[PDB]
Amino acid sequence: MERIKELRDLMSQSRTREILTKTTVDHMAIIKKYTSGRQEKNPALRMKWMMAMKYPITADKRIMEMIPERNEQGQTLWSKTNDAGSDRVMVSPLAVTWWNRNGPTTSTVHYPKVYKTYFEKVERLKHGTFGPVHFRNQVKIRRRVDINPGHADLSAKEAQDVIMEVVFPNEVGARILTSESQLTITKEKKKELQDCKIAPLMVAYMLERELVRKTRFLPVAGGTSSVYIEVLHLTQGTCWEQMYTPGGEVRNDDVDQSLIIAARNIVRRATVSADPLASLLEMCHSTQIGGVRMVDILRQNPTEEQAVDICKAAMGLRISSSFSFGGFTFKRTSGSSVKREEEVLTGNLQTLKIRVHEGYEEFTMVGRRATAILRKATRRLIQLIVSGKDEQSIAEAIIVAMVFSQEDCMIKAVRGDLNFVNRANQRLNPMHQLLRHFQKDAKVLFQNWGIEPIDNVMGMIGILPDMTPSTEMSLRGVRVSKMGVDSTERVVVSIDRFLRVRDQRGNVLLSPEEVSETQGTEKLTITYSSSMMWEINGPESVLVNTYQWIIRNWENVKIQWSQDPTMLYNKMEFEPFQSLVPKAARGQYSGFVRVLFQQMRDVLGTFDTVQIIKLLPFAAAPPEQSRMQFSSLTVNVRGSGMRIVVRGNSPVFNYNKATKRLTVLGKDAGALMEDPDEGTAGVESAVLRGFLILGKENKRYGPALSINELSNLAKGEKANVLIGQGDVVLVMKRKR
């Protein structure tokens, strides 16, 4: 046998014998990388230099017997010299071309199977569909996406075990495949890889690529699924979007997530409409997910989601009135709740702002290996009855119910290193973070939750923190039922004008209020096909496109604002912006801005095009009279309140006077043509409700005053007010 003969020869040589005998297998990892050569600091230069010499390539010694030393032209394909630091010999590129020309051919039917990922890229690009290219003010946000979806059912370790089985069955070790998915994929791969001469290392690397999920932080603007990320360069550009639909099958999870995102955006946008039901219907009939119409995916996609359910109700489809959480499908059998954000301090001394649900409510929990009935109040688990098949399932159900309760002891039970912001400092979902932390370890949570006296409740034995069943004592409000209690029914519902879903009896099942406020990213690119293409985009895109639309239509917007501002405010183009405006402050902001616009109209001159551009979107909502003074207007953006400053320049809304160009969130929105009627002349008169800005202060009418308390002035008097970025200015209460 060749290899044993080589081993005998190596043992024959004294120095190689000493190396082989002395060095251990552990020490091999160190001496394997033993190299005198150093990494080339500028490989491009070295490569350019070495392509001029005769023999820059190195090949295995066997080349000398399987390639002639020279071709018919006499050019030496290879030489006798031995490559430095190895037994390989020197070779010219001519040798490689000769091998590709008249070399020994073999079978390559296996290559597509082992390089499955690359040929899948080829195939799904072949069957992709190209739509029109649309030139739009693209706003790409940097976020983690997946480049290699991997085999989701199999974690990285399972993928490694399968790779060892398939490629190196003898070197597996003690590992045994348990997950059925492992067995099936190992089987198919072994059958496919039969008599594969390709190097086992390459097969292992390709299998690692195919199976192990890999993610990457990339600036994206469409779907974040792999089928869309790999073609990201082709699809999304700086100023254009290429409507592309990759061919082949699409993971059901990605379509479900994208449908949820689209439904959330549509309902959130449709709430601020004058006819929310009709608007929602129009965005449903005009939206497409992954190249598929959104109208016909709801009737075939049972994904449970209050937004998806509202959309289904709008089309007459029976809803479930359920929602996923922690892997369990929750159906609210009875009770009602209202969302409200509230700040909590965790057990690890970290401060969180979690969305608490005020109100008593009762849920039915359905899981893959568990089922429970829960009743909770505001941050209080009134009762929980679990019916898990095994202790692990019971523990999972109990932990999920515990976290879902949002109880203070739950929050205070956090211990160790738990971070609620990723490495990009993006705010994570606190509920998901708590679920992950407690599923990793729940000893502290059960210890700090409490124990309740339990009587001999028939078929409802209590459970203790150590997971052993008990009769007299149990976790507070937690019981375990052995009746295997085990909802899916789709009840037909009627949805009113304002998207309030009521069953036959008339109780409000779903309302837009309980729709999640998070602004997630779709897995599959979502395309909207109305006149204003940006209705269902993220916050930044909506802001930029709203201001860009105002700029473009500025010629008509000016005249409409001067002679008929009520219709300008009605303009639907501002509704998505209002969707970003917080619901509580919408009316007050609209009233304040409308009053400022009216005073600007009344006062001769003092016209400010940039100010109108800045404040016009906020005027869409119905006015709400108030005396409060606004230093900035707030808009929701990915859970952050962006403050648009009424007076001055702020990063959210910028007007570069040198270029006369307006940039929103760092994205250019266009330039404002010079308006001879502007005539700012220092005085603005469109900053404070009922006040006129004289200009720089003069330290005779008063030292300084604050914006809010400035309302003390009665009429006519002049005073200095601290408004803006530390720029005290003189003001006066308008005559009327």
Binding site: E304, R368, L435, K443, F446
Partner: peptide, 17 residues
């Protein structure tokens, strides 16, 4: 029968010992 539509988080629990 009983099935989970979408299960986030790592799952399991170290309390069981």
């Amino acid at each position: 029968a009983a099935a989970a539509a979408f299960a986030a988080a790592g799952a399991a629990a170290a309390a069981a010992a």
